[PDB]
């Protein structure tokens, strides 16, 4: 469809506008059968370095892998409706708080590792650069407590994401609050 | 020397190839592996001539930093560099020990032949191990023409070159003598030096009479 939120909440003008572009694209393209079974949860547009902005289209986790097969086509087509706006597709994963000794509860179900903050933040980093692939990951712990993550992407698919490394840093900083610099080693 | 005027020209690299300054024997020291370009098929290690030129000017900078030229000591124990260091000492103004270095020359103060320089320059670190070891008891730096199979036990400026070989060692003493004089107000650096590199070449007594 267009958008199916979990709760009874309704999208705003921008999230509905992105949903309108998705249903309109499926009507007059080869993505008809693939976009009918898929939908999105939310779509938030943020700003990046300079006078540029990018949007973050959230997709449910069970529909993530099916969304990756057509992401290379959806990114090029959606960036034509919004020229100076990059698009990214990051799944909507929930982070469960770790079980402390103060929060009163009865039957918490062990908090699986997939819901940990470390696993979610690493999964977001992978889906943010889906056309490429993380080949290595460094953590530059500077002189102070502030660290810096250095992600090593594939040498291939570089001509596609060589300009989105600035948007990937702004998106990952907006969702997780971490500094990331991307490199392309050989 | 990292400038543009301190780069070796075509006539300098031709003399290194003619003498054999890049040939570095069959053995290799782990301290000299950064100065070797690539080992040949016959086990010979090729010494990088560009890195030799950088260590040569770095050696010439330390020599000019010595105010009194007499405070520089140029020791050569082997016959291959006896007359080379004598012409080097005369061209610059430094001291020299062309014969046999008497033990205790730098340490035994009451000895007659007692000389305390400010900068030691030896030909072969292995053949001149006694002047190097004795200079360690004092604060005497070291500039040595180090081959590939040459230990850097007490070497401060290792000049990678073919220390063994009459034409090879004589050219290095001639190259250093020119760069030390060029860094001073003696040579214009545009006209080639009048002194030929054949004046520093050790000649066997069989070839002198002919």
């Amino acid at each position: 469809a267009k958008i199916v939120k979990p709760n009874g909440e309704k999208p705003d003008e921008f999230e509905s506008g992105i949903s309108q572009a998705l249903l309109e694209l499926e009507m007059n393209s080869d993505l008809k059968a693939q976009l009918r079974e898929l939908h999105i949860t939310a779509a938030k547009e943020i700003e990046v370095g300079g006078s540029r902005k990018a949007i973050i289209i959230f997709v449910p986790v069970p529909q993530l892998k099916s969304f990756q097969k057509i992401q290379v086509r959806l990114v090029r087509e959606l960036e034509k409706k919004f020229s100076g706006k990059h698009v990214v597709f990051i799944a909507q994963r929930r982070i469960l708080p770790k079980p402390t000794r103060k929060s009163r509860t009865k039957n918490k179900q062990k908090r699986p590792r997939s819901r940990t903050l470390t696993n979610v933040h690493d999964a977001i980093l992978e889906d943010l650069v889906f056309p490429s692939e993380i080949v290595g990951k460094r953590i530059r712990v500077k002189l102070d407590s502030s660290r810096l993550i250095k992600v090593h992407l594939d040498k291939a698919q570089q001509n596609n994401v060589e300009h989105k490394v600035e948007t990937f840093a702004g998106v990952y900083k907006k969702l997780t609050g971490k500094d990331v610099i991307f490199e392309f080693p050989e | 020397g990292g400038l543009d005027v301190l780069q070796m020209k075509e006539e300098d690299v031709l003399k290194f190839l003619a003498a054999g300054t890049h040939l570095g024997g069959t053995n290799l020291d782990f301290q000299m592996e950064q100065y070797v370009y690539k080992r040949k098929s016959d086990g010979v290690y090729i010494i990088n001539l560009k890195k030799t030129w950088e260590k040569l000017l770095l050696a010439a900078r330390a020599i000019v930093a010595i105010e009194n030229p007499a405070d520089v000591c140029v020791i050569s124990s082997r016959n291959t560099g006896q007359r080379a260091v004598l012409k080097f000492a005369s061209a610059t103004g430094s001291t020299t020990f062309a014969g046999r270095f008497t033990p205790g020359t730098f340490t035994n103060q009451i000895q007659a032949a007692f000389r305390e320089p400010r900068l030691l320059i030896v030909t072969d670190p292995r053949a001149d191990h006694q002047p190097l070891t004795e200079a360690s008891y004092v604060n005497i730096p070291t500039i040595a023409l180090c081959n590939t199979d040459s230990p850097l036990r007490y070497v401060d400026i290792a000049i990678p070159c073919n220390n063994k070989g009459p034409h090879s060692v004589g050219l290095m003493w001639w190259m250093l003598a020119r760069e030390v004089l060029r860094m001073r107000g003696t040579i214009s650096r545009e006209h080639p030096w009048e002194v030929m590199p054949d004046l520093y070449f050790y000649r066997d007594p069989e070839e002198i009479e002919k």
Binding site: G136, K137, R138, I139, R140, V141, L143, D144 | -
Partner: protein, 129 residues
């Protein structure tokens, strides 16, 4: 086998420091090591370090500033109260003017001076001076 990976980390740093090295690679990475290297870095004993993150325990490459004399651990990891902390300072630290004893308290891994200000004790990891 490999027990007390923090000991193998500080032993590698202490050795590489005496050899005059500038960078030392630590094979097993741990949050206890990073919390230990951060306290050593906040006082100007080691430089920056990159946590090389493979899909395993991970490795660390630490820069050395030549200011460290010796870094070691206390293997039994005794429980240090706020009253017995003064006794550990005299035995381990070479002087009352410098050197630190990294403790593990409920407020986090920190040195002995910070444990006095926060008024809390715990277990002792090691020392560095």
């Amino acid at each position: 086998v490999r027990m007390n990976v923090l000991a193998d980390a500080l032993k590698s740093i202490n050795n590489a420091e005496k050899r005059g090295k500038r960078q030392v690679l630590l094979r097993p990475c741990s949050k206890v090591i990073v919390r230990f290297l951060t306290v050593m870095m906040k006082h100007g004993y080691i430089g920056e370090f990159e946590i090389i993150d493979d899909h395993r325990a991970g490795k660390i490459v630490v820069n050395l500033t030549g200011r460290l004399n010796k870094c070691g651990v206390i293997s039994p990891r005794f429980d240090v109260q706020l009253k017995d902390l003064e006794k550990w300072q005299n035995n381990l630290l070479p002087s009352r003017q410098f050197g630190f004893i990294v403790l593990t308290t409920s407020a986090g891994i920190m040195d002995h001076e910070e444990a006095r200000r926060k008024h809390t004790g715990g277990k002792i990891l090691g020392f560095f001076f």
